[PDB]
Amino acid sequence: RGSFVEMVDNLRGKSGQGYYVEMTVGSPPQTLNILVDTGSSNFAVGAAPHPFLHRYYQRQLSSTYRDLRKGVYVPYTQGKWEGELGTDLVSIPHGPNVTVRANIAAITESDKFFINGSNWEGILGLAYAEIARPDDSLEPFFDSLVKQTHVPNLFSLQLCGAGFPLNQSEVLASVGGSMIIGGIDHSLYTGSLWYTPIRREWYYEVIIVRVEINGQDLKMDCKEYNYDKSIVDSGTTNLRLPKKVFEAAVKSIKAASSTEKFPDGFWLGEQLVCWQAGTTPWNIFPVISLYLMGEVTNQSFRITILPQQYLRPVEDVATSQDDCYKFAISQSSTGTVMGAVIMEGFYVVFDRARKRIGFAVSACHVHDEFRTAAVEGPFVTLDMEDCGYN
Numbered sequence: 001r002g003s004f005v006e007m008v009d010n011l012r013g014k015s016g017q018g019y020y021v022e023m024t025v026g027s028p029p030q031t032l033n034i035l036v037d038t039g040s041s042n043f044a045v046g047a048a049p050h051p052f053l054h055r056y057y058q059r060q061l062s063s064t065y066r067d068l069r070k071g072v073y074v075p076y077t078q079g080k081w082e083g084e085l086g087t088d089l090v091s092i093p094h095g096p097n098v099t100v101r102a103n104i105a106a107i108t109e110s111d112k113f114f115i116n117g118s119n120w121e122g123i124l125g126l127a128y129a130e131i132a133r134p135d136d137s138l139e140p141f142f143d144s145l146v147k148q149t150h151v152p153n154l155f156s157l158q159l160c161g162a163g164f165p166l167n168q169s170e171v172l173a174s175v176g177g178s179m180i181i182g183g184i185d186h187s188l189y190t191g192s193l194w195y196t197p198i199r200r201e202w203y204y205e206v207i208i209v210r211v212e213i214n215g216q217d218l219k220m221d222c223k224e225y226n227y228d229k230s231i232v233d234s235g236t237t238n239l240r241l242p243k244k245v246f247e248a249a250v251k252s253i254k255a256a257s258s259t260e261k262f263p264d265g266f267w268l269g270e271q272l273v274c275w276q277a278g279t280t281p282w283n284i285f286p287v288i289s290l291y292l293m294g295e296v297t298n299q300s301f302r303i304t305i306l307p308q309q310y311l312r313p314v315e316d317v318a319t320s321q322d323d324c325y326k327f328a329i330s331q332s333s334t335g336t337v338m339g340a341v342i343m344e345g346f347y348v349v350f351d352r353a354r355k356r357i358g359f360a361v362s363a364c365h366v367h368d369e370f371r372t373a374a375v376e377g378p379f380v381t382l383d384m385e386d387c388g389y390n
């Protein structure tokens with residue numbers, strides 16, 4: 001019955017623009033909004049004016065700033081930045097009551113990284129040292145936090161999708177979810193928490209052992225589901241699937257929803273589809289179940305998501321009264337990515353101390369009168385470690 005009221009509701013944002021938490025850096029404290037990112041391992045903040053930044057880190061104004069006299073260059077598939085490494089004192093106001101000295105990449109140049117109107121000015125990489133830039137000697141924030149305090153080595157995330165689009169006033173005003181640092185808040189989920197092992201501590205890597213679309217088995221060699229890895233990543237919008245899986249899944253989703261036909265651009269994730277107010281035909285779209293390796297030998301469990309999760313609400317071009325959505329599943333050449341739109345269905349427990357990730361149905365997940373998201377088990381499943389790619 002852990003309650004963490006200082007932390008409940010400490011997030012804002014939306015799957016399309018990222019979820020962020022308020023943080024302070026430096027002495028006296030400089031307030032910044034920071035993207036919560038389980039798919040990376042650098043704490044990096046805007047440190048120089050940029051047209052899309054409303055504020056930034058001013059190292060010269062901080063008496064506790066330490067310069068590491070080393071640059072870092074961080075290119076992504078889309079976008080990139082460069083920065084200067086340093087350390088400073090850092091707190092999370094709606095977090096545990098602690099201040100820690102942590103590595104900070106002070107971003108001085110960037111290209112297609114900051115997003116007009118995102119409302120965040122930096123990123124908090126919550127994954128492990130192995131994928132930190134420049135190399136694995138740069139201790140990640142969470143590692144400093146646990147080393148320097150008594151905060152238990154665990155965090156949990158409830159990302160709350162509205163189920164409808166939010167204009168910028170609403171998105172600033174609305175509670176977007178909870179990051180619970182050092183614990184599990186029982187009010188953020190229903191049902192049981194089920195756990196999957198962290199396969200290796202770099203990304204939050206997991207193993208998927210079966211996929212179903214409306215109960216029907218996708219029936220691929222399970223290695224395909226994890227080629228070349230499967231990760232849980234709050235800093236990616238979509239559910240991303242390896243090319244072959246993506247194709248198979250889209251074929252199956254088209255077939256189940258085939259009473260209605262959509263543009264190729266919809267399935268490519270590029271164009272919106274709109275229905276008359278209140279008439280979105282949720283029931284024609286299938287549920288998607290991912291089975292994950294369990295903690296017990298030969299046992300798995302499954303998480304089930306709705307189209308309310310994988311159809312991302314977007315504002316109309318004509319700005320009409322229609323309910324509009326983009327298809328939030330896309331192909332990946334870097335393995336499966338369980339992005340923000342999947343995490344919106346679940347309360348996700350990143351149990352680093354026990355090297356496992358928990359899932360439970362989210363208390364804030366969007367659904368309808370007839371179906372809800374689910375986390376169910378156990379299932380007898382054999383040869384699961386063979387699903388892992390090498």
Ligand SMILES: NC1=N[C@@H]2CC[C@H](NC(=O)c3cccc(Cl)c3)C[C@@H]2CS1
Pocket residue numbers: 015016017018019037038039040076077113115123233234235236237340
């Ligand atoms: N996990 C990853 N992290 C890095 C840094 C965050 C960035 N994400 C965003 O800007 C962003 C933009 C809009 C929505 C969301 Cl959820 C995130 C991606 C890259 C590559 S993948």
